[PDB]
Amino acid sequence: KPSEMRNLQATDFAKEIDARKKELMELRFQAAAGQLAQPHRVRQLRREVAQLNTVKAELARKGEQ
Amino acid sequence: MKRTYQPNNRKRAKTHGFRARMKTKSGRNILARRRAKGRHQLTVSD
Amino acid sequence: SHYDILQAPVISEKAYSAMERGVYSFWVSPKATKTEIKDAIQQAFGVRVIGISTMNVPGKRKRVGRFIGQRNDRKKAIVRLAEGQSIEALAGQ
Amino acid sequence: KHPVPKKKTSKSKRDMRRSHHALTAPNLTECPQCHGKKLSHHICPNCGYYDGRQVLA
RNA sequence: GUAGGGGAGCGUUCAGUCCGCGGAGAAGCCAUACCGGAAGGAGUGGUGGAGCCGACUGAAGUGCGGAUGCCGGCAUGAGUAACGAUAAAAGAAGUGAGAAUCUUCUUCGCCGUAAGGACAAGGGUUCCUGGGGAAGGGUCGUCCGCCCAGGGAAAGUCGGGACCUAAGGUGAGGCCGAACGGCGCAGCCGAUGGACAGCAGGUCAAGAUUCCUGCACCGAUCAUGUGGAGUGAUGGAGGGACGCAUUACGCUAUCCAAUGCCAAGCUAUGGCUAUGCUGGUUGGUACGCUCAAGGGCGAUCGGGUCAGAAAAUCUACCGGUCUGCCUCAGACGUAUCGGGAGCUUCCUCGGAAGCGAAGUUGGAAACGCGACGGUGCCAAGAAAAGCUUCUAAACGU
RNA sequence: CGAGCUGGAGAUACGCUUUGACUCGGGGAUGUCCGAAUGGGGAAACCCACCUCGUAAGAGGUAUCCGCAAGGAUGGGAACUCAGGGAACUGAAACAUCUCAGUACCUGAAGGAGAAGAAAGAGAAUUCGAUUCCGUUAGUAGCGGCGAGCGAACCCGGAUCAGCCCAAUCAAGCCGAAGUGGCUGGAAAGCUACACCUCAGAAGGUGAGAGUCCUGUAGGCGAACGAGAGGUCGUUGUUCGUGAAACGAUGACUGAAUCCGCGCGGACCACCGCGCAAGGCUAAAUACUCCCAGUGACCGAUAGCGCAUAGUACCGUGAGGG
Ligand SMILES: [K+]
Ligand SMILES: [K+]
Ligand SMILES: [Mg+2]
Ligand SMILES: [Mg+2]
Ligand SMILES: [Mg+2]
Ligand SMILES: [Mg+2]
Ligand SMILES: [Mg+2]
Ligand SMILES: [Mg+2]
Ligand SMILES: [Mg+2]
Ligand SMILES: [Mg+2]
Ligand SMILES: [Mg+2]
Ligand SMILES: [Mg+2]
Ligand SMILES: [Mg+2]
Ligand SMILES: [Mg+2]
Ligand SMILES: [Mg+2]
Ligand SMILES: [Mg+2]
Ligand SMILES: [Mg+2]
Ligand SMILES: [Mg+2]
Ligand SMILES: [Mg+2]
Ligand SMILES: [Mg+2]
Ligand SMILES: [Mg+2]
Ligand SMILES: [Mg+2]
Ligand SMILES: [Mg+2]
Ligand SMILES: [Mg+2]
Ligand SMILES: [Mg+2]
Ligand SMILES: [Mg+2]
Ligand SMILES: [Mg+2]
Ligand SMILES: [Mg+2]
Ligand SMILES: [Mg+2]
Ligand SMILES: [Mg+2]
Ligand SMILES: [Mg+2]
Ligand SMILES: [Mg+2]
Ligand SMILES: [Mg+2]
Ligand SMILES: [Mg+2]
Ligand code: NA
Ligand code: NA
Ligand code: NA
Ligand code: NA
Ligand code: NA
Ligand code: NA
Ligand code: NA
Ligand code: NA
Ligand code: NA
């Protein structure tokens, strides 16, 4: 989340996005499958997506004004 | 024995409806008075 | 993207039993047309789709209390794959 | 309604009326077979006899 | 001693002040035979589980039997009247803590131009499955349209939208008005109408013209091939296009008969012994010089100017010249697919799976179809698009 | 800020937290759909488009009224302000004026306030001197089927007090003095014997009543940085209802002067006196209260808002009631 997350280029952001969304979908299938034993994993990924997007959007003003 | 009440969606909504209310200020006032005396629920919601 | 749109897999005896003949069924986003749901379903399991049919499905319940219910407004989708069946590993639950 | 009463009735009167409402106690017998109490000229609902045994226990 | 006037006080809440009480227990409630001239006050006991007397003074949302008063609770009418069409029901068996009321069986009865079936409107999970028995159910309830959870709803062609128009609604500009606003052309919205591409079957507990089995149609896009040439608007025209009454001919859905055909076995009561009894006796698609009623249809050329804004090879009008094919409701034949009385086996109680015979003759036959029929009548019976044809513009031969 | 957190939520599981979690302030980034709704249609939250930028996803734009542009406006607000329009019951113990009343309602516009405002005035002292509001004048003068009833202003006191410009400290938060024993008790903050603080004896909680147990109060500290013309005709206003009826205002006809000028001073005239329109803007003193704090000889739930939350259930086609 700190400077070790914005260090990546522009594309890798989207990459993390879609990947997390994938895993998130998996755990989500498990939810209705009656197997999900890691809710904090769901919440966590939810958080990380918002982080990524936030950050990226923060690089939208810093360097162009 | 037809009663006064003869259900019909395209009319209960045609009159008394949100847009029905908008077309005339005299209805706007109704909306306003309904959103004013506390929470309420209009006629397009029911 | 592709991984979105869908919701959860249809869990029932008819879904499971109809899965045996290469017919799949899962819940999707009501506000989702029948194209992006095809594109999406395809780009997620690596399979093309021939058959497709979805419909909307309300819900409205409650237990006790005096707080009636609420519509849960869903939409179930059913897709039919070509010759190559048994997708991933979740086709044998 | 023509059939209306003039005044409300008194507890006293309204009870005197009810002085004929007492249920009679069932006169019960002792069954000579399964020593259970039964109803005269009927069948012992317990063992099931009535001069030898008729109904299924 | 009524209306009325005058005087002295009681009681309640709040406020200031003072004296205080309270876990060994306040207020409140409950009992009581004590005190005071009244309103009232006190002692003791019981209950209670936190606060509150007395005195003085100030201020009031200050004293209730009434108002067909207001709210709430509970009585009387009384175990009374009723339990919602006079289409009665009976027995066995099962389940269960408990059955007149639920389940199963065999009878009985009632509707049958419905009390059967399928839709629109409307109601929204009431459907299906498994539980539950508080309340609802005019009695019971093990059950229910009630409670709980879970499941179920599948469309290129059926409804609607992405097409069209009517009344109506709306409406730039415009015409008007103290405001608000009211009117109004085109246009747009608006199915109750117009237009438009498939049917026949099977099958979950619960869906079907939606899923699939067979077979098929429509539009768009692309490729290949044939072809060798224009393709043709928001334009014009043609047409969609419209009634009521009666009525000829043919046919079907559908229905009836039999010593037609197929299948099943049995039939005692008195008889029949099968010329008896029961049941079944075709749907879609493709093809055929097969059978057939009915239904509606000019082409071409030429001329003029004032006609369709303009224009045209299109349309109308004027002028010359002259049975037929077109289309086939439906029937029949062949083929194929499906269906079909029932039979067979297993059975977790009764479902699933597999198999499968024949379709003959005669008669009846509509408010359906062959059609936009024929005839008669006066009250003289939407629009627009798709569709067809033909120009301009433009692009291309 | 310094150990907890994991929303009202009573429960279970998985987890986040000295690389300061939550919580409390203060700026940003994401904000589908509807709604002034504004692509078009629309029975609101639906349906259908086109164009542009393109890696598909996706994003962006596409309403109307003023302008070269920037930009601004059609929206929403409980009450309050101004404006257009404008009742009746009721009163007169009937009822026509008049009252009710420019009340209610309707509508337009705008703000945190508006209106009004820098003299063609009030007034009679040869004076005061923008406007508004408060007190008073006074319920006088005056109006009125002279009935019902309506009702100013000047002077003076006071809140606040400016005239300049065109045309020719409050929100986070931290810091913060002073008690032990014994006794009744289930449990004391009570009783009791001693002691202390007191620029803190407001108050709440803690097994009951509470200075010294807790949170706080007096007081002190406190950030990145966030706020502070005339006239005639028809009528009307002011106390003024046609009355001797001025003046202001307006609809319809007409239509003056400007320096020995023009208006006014309750028809009119002379004298005298005050004042100079037909252009505009402009704090404060004033009103009200959705919202917040504090306070109460305010209620303590048949009260108090309708609601110890609900405009819900419930009634109605609906406005609406509740
Ligand atoms: K025989
Ligand atoms: K037969
Ligand atoms: Mg399909
Ligand atoms: Mg339910
Ligand atoms: Mg206590
Ligand atoms: Mg009183
Ligand atoms: Mg009474
Ligand atoms: Mg009486
Ligand atoms: Mg009562
Ligand atoms: Mg009796
Ligand atoms: Mg009686
Ligand atoms: Mg009787
Ligand atoms: Mg009876
Ligand atoms: Mg009766
Ligand atoms: Mg009966
Ligand atoms: Mg019965
Ligand atoms: Mg009949
Ligand atoms: Mg439905
Ligand atoms: Mg059922
Ligand atoms: Mg019961
Ligand atoms: Mg009952
Ligand atoms: Mg569909
Ligand atoms: Mg109009
Ligand atoms: Mg229709
Ligand atoms: Mg259609
Ligand atoms: Mg079945
Ligand atoms: Mg069905
Ligand atoms: Mg819109
Ligand atoms: Mg006026
Ligand atoms: Mg008069
Ligand atoms: Mg007047
Ligand atoms: Mg004048
Ligand atoms: Mg109350
Ligand atoms: Mg009460
Ligand atoms: Na007493
Ligand atoms: Na059709
Ligand atoms: Na006929
Ligand atoms: Na015989
Ligand atoms: Na904290
Ligand atoms: Na009167
Ligand atoms: Na207003
Ligand atoms: Na006049
Ligand atoms: Na009470």
Residue ranges of the domains in chain A? 1-65
CA atoms within 13 A on the CB side of C81: 21
Nearest nucleotide to A32 (CA to C1') is E150
Q: Is the CB of B43 under 7 A from strand F?
A: yes
Note the CA–C1' distance, B44 to E308, in angstroms: 53
Q: Are strands C23-28 and D28-30 parallel, antiparallel or unpaired?
A: unpaired
Strand partners, C65: none
Task: Note down the domain range covering B4.
Answer: 1-46
Q: Is the CB of A57 under 7 A from strand F?
A: yes
**Chain C contacts of A29, Cβ < 8 Å?**
8-9, 90
* C neighbours by CB contacts (3+ pairs under 8 Å): A
Among chain C, residues having any CB pair with chain A shorter than 8 Å are 1, 3-4, 6-9, 11, 27, 90, 93
Name the residue among A54, A61, A57, A25 with its Cα closest to residue A42. A25
Domain ranges of chain C: 1-93
- Nearest Cα residue in chain C from A29: C8
- To one decimal place, what's the resolution in Å? 3.2
D28 secondary structure, DSSP code:
E
Q: Which residues are in the CB-under-5-Å shell of ion ligand 3?
A: C 51
What burial letters (b/e) apply to C55-81, b meaning 16+ CB within 10 Å?
Answer: eeeeeeeeeeeeeeeeeeebbbbbbbb
Domains held by chain B: number: 1
Q: Considering the domain C1-93, what is its CATH architecture?
A: 2-Layer Sandwich (3.30)
For D54, the token pair is 């008729």
Report whether A17 contacts A52 (CB < 8 A).
yes
For residue A60, which phi and psi values (nearest 5 degrees)?
-85, -15
d(CA A42, CA A31): 10
Name the residue among A26, A18, A54 with its Cα closest to residue A42. A26
- Nearest Cα residue in chain A from C6: A25
Here the CATH number for the domain that contains residue B42 is: 1.10.287.3980
For the residues of B1-46, what is the DSSP string, one character each? ---S----HHHHTTSSSHHHHHTSHHHHHHHHHHTTSSS---TTT-
Report how far ligand 29's centroid is from the alpha carbon of B27 (Å): 27
For C93, the token pair is 């639950």
3-state secondary structure of A50: helix
Q: How was this structure determined?
A: X-ray
Residue A19 sits at the chain C interface (C-beta within 8 Å): no
3-state secondary structure of A22: helix
Nucleotides of F strand lying within 7 Å of any protein CB atom: 13-16, 28-30, 35-36, 42-46, 57-58, 76-78, 106-108, 306-307, 310-313, 316-322
